[PDB]
Design a binder for these strands. Structure first.
Ligand SMILES: Nc1ccn([C@H]2C[C@H](O)[C@@H](COP(=O)(O)CP(=O)(O)OP(=O)(O)O)O2)c(=O)n1
Ligand SMILES: [Mg+2]
Ligand code: NA
Length: 343
DNA sequence: CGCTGGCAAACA
DNA sequence: TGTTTG
DNA sequence: CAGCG
């Protein structure tokens, strides 16, 4: 009855197995660090399937019939049932390679490889890395270390709403007919997020440079702290735009103070109005929902799904969709609401 | 038992 | 082009 | 590490 695919199940923000999922997230992280991809993904798949459960696991008889649960994960669940604590997950939290990985990757622009590199070189504290005279940091890491305190503190709902006000203001000046939709975690009904995601669209447009007009508008106001611009060219080829920014958000815009503003990561995606459903589906997430939408489409339906279209391999035709509901209906899936995509 | 496991695009 | 981001 | 063919 429970599907091994996240796109074929409902995952709201009510997690009844948080004691089990917190341990499995830790064991996935350790296998990611140790670079054993298959084992990492298995712990990720299993943590995700327990989040979908409308009930908490209290006995091993509960695990029966649940996909993504094999011998190793069943033995992790058993340990939390008998003790209340996981011995395997607790060991990982005390590991020095893991502690450094979680401390060095907390910096925006630093991933697994540089965090492994710095640990190999003998680095333990984020201050020693910053106070060096040989390390060559990327523009992303220079931003990550500049705004570190504001960047590690999550974006809340009043902040996402003030960022929404800023984006809609900026967009409406260049394209007054444009539709601005909050995507990502906040569209899934989350109250906090690491960043704020948006999707911008226009039926009457000119649109080929809106993100470049909007970001130059913020730069003239001194609000563009960092920016990385992206582009692209029955469905046919793209018209697509993307802009990943770090914006200066004055506390006056949000409903000791000190600084007067907070650095927030803003992801702005722009697509043609006829490609909106695919973009909404692709940028609402979650990441697990997306990787399982792709997995299910290729393996169960002989179809290819991306953030821009859905292709039927057998019929050799692109399947058109005006809404997210039409994409689900094409794929042979029961519609999953954005707040039910928290896989 | 062996193979797969989701993607794209910008920097350096 | 490997690394990191979304 | 787990599922499929
Ligand atoms: N590995 C990835 C990362 C992201 N995406 C998609 C799905 C996600 O919802 C959206 C925004 O990413 P985000 O990085 O903003 C993540 P999300 O958790 O959805 O938002 P917040 O925590 O509120 O910031 O991009 C993807 O497909 N594959
Ligand atoms: Mg987000
Ligand atoms: Na990081």
């Amino acid at each position: 009855k429970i599907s091994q695919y996240a796109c074929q199940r409902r995952t709201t923000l009510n997690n009844y197995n948080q004691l089990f999922t917190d341990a499995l997230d830790i064991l996935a992280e350790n296998d990611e660090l140790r670079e054993n991809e298959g084992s990492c993904l298995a712990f990720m798949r299993a943590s995700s399937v327990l989040k979908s459960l409308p009930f908490p696991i209290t006995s091993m008889k509960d695990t029966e019939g649940i996909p993504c649960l094999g011998d190793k994960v069943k033995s992790i669940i058993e340990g939390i049932i008998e003790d209340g604590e996981s011995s395997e997950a607790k060991a990982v939290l005390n590991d020095e390679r893991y502690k450094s990985f979680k401390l060095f990757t907390s910096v925006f622009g630093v991933g697994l490889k540089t965090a492994e590199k710095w640990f190999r070189m003998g680095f333990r504290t984020l201050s020693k890395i910053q106070s060096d005279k040989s390390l060559r940091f990327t523009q992303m890491q220079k931003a990550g270390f500049l705004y570190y305190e504001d960047l590690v503190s999550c974006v809340n709902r009043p902040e996402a709403e003030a960022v929404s006000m800023l984006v809609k203001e900026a967009v409406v000046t260049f394209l007054p007919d444009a539709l601005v939709t909050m995507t990502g975690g906040f569209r899934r009904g989350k109250m906090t997020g690491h960043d704020v995601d948006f999707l911008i669209t226009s039926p009457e447009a000119e649109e080929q440079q809106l993100l470049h007009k909007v970001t130059d508008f913020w730069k003239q106001q001194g609000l563009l702290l960092y920016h990385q611009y992206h582009r692209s060219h029955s469905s046919t080829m793209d018209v697509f735009e993307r802009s990943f920014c770090i914006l200066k958000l004055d506390h006056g815009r949000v409903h000791q103070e000190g600084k007067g503003w907070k650095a927030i990561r803003v992801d702005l995606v722009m697509c043609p109005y006829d490609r909106r459903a695919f973009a909404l589906l692709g940028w609402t997430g979650s990441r697990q929902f997306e990787r399982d939408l792709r997995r299910y489409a290729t393996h169960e339906r002989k179809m290819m799904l991306d953030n821009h279209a859905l292709y039927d391999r057998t019929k050799r035709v692109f399947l058109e969709a005006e809404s997210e509901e039409e994409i689900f209906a094409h794929l042979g899936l029961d519609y999953i609401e954005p707040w039910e995509r928290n896989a």
